[PDB]
Amino acid sequence: KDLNRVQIDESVSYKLRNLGKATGMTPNYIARIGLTYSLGEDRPPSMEEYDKEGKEFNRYTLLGEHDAMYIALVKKRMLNEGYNPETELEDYFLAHLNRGIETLSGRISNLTDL
């Protein structure tokens, strides 16, 4: 229901510190962009891949004043794809959060110089 506190995967949390170093930006802002990038990706994200042992986010800090809009957008995309928001919203949300951060990392890790 609330979705108040959530945890990304541990290895993704490492990738996020590196994006932080590369970029000079706060984790919330990098994660929000990633989540947005993943929510506009064609393919569904993997529901198998990610643990919840990494960094904790607060929905208020993470999404900000667009929280209801991001939540609703996620619930629509779920119902479309075949998932149930009443059972899987946390898992489905985190699948996009993790995938978003990985996608950014996969390009930006390469820089090394950054």
Residue numbers in the entry: 3 to 116
What does the literature reporting this entry say, word for word?
Phosphorothioate (PT) modification, a sequence-specific modification that replaces the nonbridging oxygen atom with sulfur in a DNA phosphodiester through the gene products of dndABCDE or sspABCD, is widely distributed in prokaryotes. DNA PT modification functions together with gene products encoded by dndFGH, pbeABCD, or sspE to form defense systems that can protect against invasion by exogenous DNA particles. While the functions of the multiple enzymes in the PT system have been elucidated, the exact role of DndE in the PT process is still obscure. DndE can form a complex with IscS, DndC, and DndD in vitro to confer the DNA PT modification, and deletion of the dndE gene in S. enterica serovar Cerro 87 completely abolishes the PT modification at 5′-GPSAAC-3′/5′-GPSTTC-3′ (24).
In this study, we determined the crystal structure of the DndE protein from the haloalkaliphilic archaea Natronorubrum bangense JCM10635 at a resolution of 2.31 Å. Size-exclusion chromatography was used for DndE aggregation state analysis, which confirmed that DndE formed a monomer consisting of the five α-helices H1 (residues 12 to 25), H2 (residues 29 to 42), H3 (residues 61 to 65), H4 (residues 69 to 83), and H5 (residues 90 to 113); two β-sheets (β1 [residues 7 to 10] and β2 [residues 56 to 60]); and a long flexible linker (residues 43 to 55) between H2 and β2. Sequence alignment of DndE from bacterial E. coli B7A and archaeal N. bangense JCM10635 showed only 22% identity. However, the two DndE structures from E. coli B7A and N. bangense JCM10635 can be superimposed with a root mean square deviation of 2.138 Å over 75 Cα atoms. Unlike the tetrameric conformation of DndE from E. coli B7A, the archaeal DndE from N. bangense JCM10635 forms a monomer. The difference in the aggregation state of the archaeal DndE protein indicated Dnd protein interactions that were likely different from those in bacteria. The in vitro reaction showed that DndE was capable of nicking circular pUC19 plasmid DNA to nicked products, followed by generating linearized DNA fragments. Although the PT modification occurs at 5′-GPSATC-3′/5′-GPSATC-3′ in N. bangense JCM10635 (11), we did not detect sequence-selective nicking at the 5′-GATC-3′ site when the gel-purified DndE-nicked pUC19 DNA was subjected to runoff sequencing. Together with the result that DndE had similar nicking activity against PT- and non–PT-modified pUC19 plasmids, these results demonstrate that DndE introduced nicks onto DNA in a non–sequence-specific and PT-independent manner. Our results showed that DndE displayed a binding affinity of 48.4 ± 2.3 μM to intact dsDNA and showed a binding affinity of 18.8 ± 2.8 μM to nicked DNA (nDNA), which shares the same DNA sequence as dsDNA but has a nick between dG and dA within the 5′-GATC-3′/5′-GATC-3′ motif. In terms of the archaeal DndE, the preferential binding for nicked DNA is attributed to the R19- and K23-containing positively charged surface.
